């Protein structure tokens, strides 16, 4: 190779493959020894002056250096990395804010040990989109809406490549099936001294929704004791308040609620928790 003062090269190989590592432009009948991480190898894996590796695994990656026989004079260096070809990515778009834009996440099912390159292209019919990204994460560009009730479906495609292969995937959807708000926060329960079988339950709206007045939501309330394991399902109308009348006398409870728009979207995840027992007269 080049001068021994150089940095080692980067060479990627497959898992279970076979590859030979020569000592640069040296001859075949030259005295050459190899060392991995400072440990010398056995002469059984040397085909003259080259290094022959059979059955590459995850433990064969590292710094392979070429030295003179029984010496510390460096000749050639190379960094070997073992990885797998990429698989079909898992693309999923979600509209956390219906009046505003949406976002799309993607990830590989089987992890790879080498860096990857991703490129996403979003189409609204025959037009082009930019999807300027502003997240704290990556692998998202947050496509922003421009028209409403356009009846035209969106097309998103993400392509991934590697030093050993490449792959791509694409999905299609509308502007209504990807709508899913965030669960409400600070769901607190309070006792009621006025009634024996009562519990004050009040929640809020998700902070991500910028325009809730023009697009109301429907809440699904679930209240259940801690020992019966029999959950109850009660769907509510417009409002962030409820009143239960058939709860326990003294035992604890867990109440969780979700959110969903009036005509579009899907049901959201449940809230964190709730714990309160009704008042006891003594």
């Amino acid at each position, epitope marked *: 190779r080049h001068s021994p003062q150089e940095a080692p090269h980067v060479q990627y190989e497959r898992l279970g493959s076979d590859v030979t590592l020569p000592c640069g432009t040296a001859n075949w009948d030259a005295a050459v020894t190899w060392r991995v991480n400072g440990t010398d190898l056995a002469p059984d894996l040397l085909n003259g002056s080259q290094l022959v590796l059979h059955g590459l695994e995850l433990g064969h990656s590292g710094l392979y250096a070429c030295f003179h026989r029984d010496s510390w004079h460096l000749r050639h260096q190379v960094l070997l990395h073992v990885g797998l070809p990429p698989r*079909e990515p898992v693309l999923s778009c979600r509209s956390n804010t219906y009046p505003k834009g949406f976002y799309c996440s993607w990830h590989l099912p089987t992890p790879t040990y080498i860096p990857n*390159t991703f490129n996403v*292209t979003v*189409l609204h019919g*025959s037009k082009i989109m930019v999807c300027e990204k502003d997240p704290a994460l990556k692998n998202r560009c947050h496509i922003r809406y421009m028209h409403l009730f356009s009846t035209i479906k969106y*097309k998103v*495609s993400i*392509s991934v*490549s*590697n*030093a050993l292969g*490449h792959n*791509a*995937t*694409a*999905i299609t959807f509308d502007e209504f099936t990807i709508v899913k708000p965030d669960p409400p926060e600070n769901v607190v329960a309070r006792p009621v001294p006025s009634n024996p079988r009562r519990l004050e339950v009040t929640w809020q709206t998700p902070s991500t929704w910028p325009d809730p007045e023009s697009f109301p939501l429907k809440f699904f309330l679930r209240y259940r004791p801690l020992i019966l394991d029999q959950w109850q399902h009660v769907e509510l109308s417009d409002g962030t308040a409820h009143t239960i009348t058939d709860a326990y006398a003294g035992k604890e409870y867990i109440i969780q609620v979700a959110a969903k728009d009036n005509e579009i979207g899907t049901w959201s995840d449940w809230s964190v928790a709730a714990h309160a027992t009704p008042w006891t007269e003594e």
Partner: antibody, heavy 117, light 109 residues
Framework: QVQLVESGGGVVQPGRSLRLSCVAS????????MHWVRQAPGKGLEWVAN????????FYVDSVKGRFTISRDNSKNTLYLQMNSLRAEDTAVYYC??????????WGQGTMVTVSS | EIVLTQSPGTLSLSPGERATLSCRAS???????LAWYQQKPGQAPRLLIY???SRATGIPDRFSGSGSGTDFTLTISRLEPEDFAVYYC?????????FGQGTKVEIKR
């Protein structure tokens, strides 16, 4: 307007080497994927090579592995293809693509390459 | 490797009729990554429909495509004198970029 121009092809002998060039214009060459598609006289199309926008990831077909080398230059908006050790089954007309939706959006006028003695 | 089979090999139809082409694959195409081309004698190929259901920029409205998985069909509303050429199909998703055998459309008399 958008256009692709190829050059650097001609009659050559088996075992020699050639070097093609694909100059881009009208679009952003630095933010697009380039390809190479050939077509034998009286046959169908066939993908040859592929390179990304940065230029580190390169792909070839099993019939040209070890003999061809693809390269590009984002500053001059050109696309090279180093062909070495040409054989008899390499006579075709090479093109350049853009891969908009994995469909080879743009094409060039082509270049005939003859490899025979 | 997925082999693309087009039928028929040569379609003889008069101008002004409906021409439907076919391109059957060996396996199911992933994410509907199928494209149609048009190549005239002595010219370069021309992309017509990408994704098997979306026309390209500048392609007339008479061209239309459909299909799902393995069996895709390319249907033209009515033939025109400049619509007689060779058409190909492209497969991607489960293998490197491969093309079909090709279908030639000629004038009937």
């Amino acid at each position: 307007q958008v256009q692709l121009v190829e050059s650097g092809g001609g009659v050559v002998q088996p075992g020699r080497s050639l070097r093609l060039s694909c100059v881009a214009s009208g679009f952003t060459f630095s933010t697009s994927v380039m390809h190479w598609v050939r077509q034998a006289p009286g046959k169908g199309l066939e993908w040859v090579a592929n390179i990304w926008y940065d230029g580190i990831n390169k792909f070839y077909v099993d019939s040209v592995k070890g003999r061809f080398t693809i390269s590009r230059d984002n500053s001059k908006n050109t696309l090279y293809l180093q062909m070495n050790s040409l054989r008899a089954e390499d006579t075709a007309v090479y093109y350049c693509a853009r891969e908009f939706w994995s469909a080879f959006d743009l094409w060039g006028q082509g270049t005939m390459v003859t490899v025979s003695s | 490797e997925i082999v693309l089979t087009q039928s028929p090999g040569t379609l003889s139809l008069s101008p002004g009729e409906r021409a439907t082409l076919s391109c059957r694959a060996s396996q199911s195409v992933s994410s509907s990554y199928l494209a149609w081309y048009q190549q005239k004698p002595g010219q370069a190929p021309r992309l017509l429909i990408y994704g098997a259901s979306s026309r390209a920029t500048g392609i007339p409205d008479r061209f239309s495509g459909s299909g799902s998985g393995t069996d895709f069909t390319l249907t033209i509303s009515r033939l025109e004198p400049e619509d007689f050429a060779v058409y190909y199909c492209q497969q991607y998703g489960s293998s490197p970029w491969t093309f079909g055998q090709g279908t030639k459309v000629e004038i009937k008399r």
